[PDB]
Amino acid sequence: DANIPFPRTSGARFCGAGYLVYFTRKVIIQDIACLLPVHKSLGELYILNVNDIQETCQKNAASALLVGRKDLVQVWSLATVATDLCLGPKSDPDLETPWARHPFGRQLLESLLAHYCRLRDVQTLAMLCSVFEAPRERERDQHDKNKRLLDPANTQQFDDFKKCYGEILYRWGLREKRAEVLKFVSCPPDPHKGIEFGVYCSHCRSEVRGTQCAICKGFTFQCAICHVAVRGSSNFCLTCGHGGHTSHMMEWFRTQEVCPTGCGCHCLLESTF
């Protein structure tokens, strides 16, 4: 038994997203989000909207002042000034210097990124990258690589920042923010592999993999409620195969509890495993 390890009667390790646990000679859970360079409340209050980038900047500045950090207000103010839509590059060099080559554009962003990388937090890094994400052939290619405000050589690093803040966000439990943030990734998504669904044709009764039949040139799935063609979400019944447009069966199963198609097939407890 000498070769065996020796008994351990203590321990203390990280868990969750802001807590610890120490089994040192019961166990105590103490919230320690005060020492992490990341703050959950900012994660709740933030907002990203590709429709209007300026609005996200001012609202984020307001939230930053609300949570009490006099650094993010400066950073977001510089951001909202920097991403003004009147500073857009032109697709011809021979007119004017791009804003990237200005010593207040790319270089300021690089300095701030280095500073927060030293601080070792992913929140502001991912947010800033998400916001800023927006012979003759050689000259055009070099100008194209030179217009943008984010260095093309660190796209993998920026994606890594984003997909790490995403795991943080999922850990916290506010996921819709994660689904918003994980769009700006330059990396294409992985597609799904396995089985897939097929809606038999409503006219020729053939299994067609799509919203439109390849033989009858019509709609293969018809709503079990409105009796029309559907293009949205289905969430149909797997036992009997009947289904419709999402609002319609949601309304049906609000109070009614039998298959509208008539096969009976009360799948409200069958499909829902």
Binding site: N3, G11, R13, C15, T24, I28, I32, L36, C117, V122
Partner: protein, 284 residues
């Protein structure tokens, strides 16, 4: 700050906690496990698993990527996986090959698949990469150490992939293991700086920065950080920490590799953080 009711008749060994923060985990010397309700701060027992024939050490959980899975490893040589099915906790599938007492168990990043890793005193590196339809494709690497493996730690997913993990045993040595394109878990490097029996190894979670970090605690006092700043060089440059008065067995990282908390034989937990000058500084 809330204190969970132990309700056990043995000394606990480790207390892991699920991904979202909902339920606590437990170990003891009576070969029993118990998962409680940390939600709202009211400790409610959800099970009292009559486990193996001997004391258990580690219960590290898995990602909900593949669902509610638990892991366990005991002095009575056995590896057991639990899943909370239909409102109850019950046995799901097991691993049998264990010549000696098992020392550690850790899970894998939620991009390699659903892979377990374990190490026993027999010195055999037996990954338990769970196959489909409930079976486990138990790969093995025997004679991984002169005396036996103690603990393993995996590496963050960095761009198939190039999987890795790190381990160290009672030979006062630390090893690292990569995979060939075919699937051979042979060797990548052999880092050795301590003379005492190294116990635990951990990888700092990768923010995106091209600098790794391996904080490991040996038997006597060796708490050397194992930074590997250069990707091509594959050279680890120690930066030793303070020397503990007693033996140190555990190590754990924060979620952004900022704070390091170590567990030692003095029944105390001290929280550390690297300073501006690169030195590691303790905290309150």
């Amino acid at each position: 700050i809330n204190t969970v009711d132990t309700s056990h008749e043995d000394m606990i060994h480790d207390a892991q906690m699920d991904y979202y923060g909902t339920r606590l985990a437990t170990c003891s010397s009576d070969r029993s496990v118990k998962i409680f309700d940390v939600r709202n701060g009211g400790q409610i027992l959800i099970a009292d698993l009559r486990g193996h024939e001997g004391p258990v050490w580690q219960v590290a959980w898995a990602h909900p990527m593949y669902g509610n899975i638990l892991a366990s490893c005991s002095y009575d040589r056995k590896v057991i996986i639990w899943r909370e099915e239909n409102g109850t906790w019950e046995k799901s599938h097991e691993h049998a090959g264990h010549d000696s007492s098992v020392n550690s168990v850790c899970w894998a990043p939620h991009d390699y698949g659903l892979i377990l890793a374990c190490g026993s005193s027999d010195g055999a590196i037996s990954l338990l990469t769970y196959t489909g339809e409930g079976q486990w494709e138990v790969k093995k690497i025997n004679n991984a150490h002169t005396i036996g493996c103690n603990a393993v730690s995996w590496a963050p997913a960095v761009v198939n992939y190039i999987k890795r993990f790190a381990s160290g045993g009672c030979d006062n040595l630390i090893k690292l293991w990569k995979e060939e394109e075919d699937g051979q878990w042979k060797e990548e490097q052999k880092l050795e700086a301590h003379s005492d029996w190294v116990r635990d190894v951990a990888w700092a979670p990768s923010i995106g920065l091209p600098t790794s970090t391996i904080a490991s605690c040996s038997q006597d006092g060796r708490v050397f950080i194992w930074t590997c700043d250069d990707a091509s060089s594959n050279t680890w440059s120690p930066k030793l920490l303070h020397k503990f008065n007693d033996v140190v067995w555990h190590v754990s990282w924060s979620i952004t590799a900022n704070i390091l908390a170590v567990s030692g034989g003095d029944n105390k937990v001290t929280l550390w953080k690297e300073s501006v000058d690169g030195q590691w500084v303790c905290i309150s």
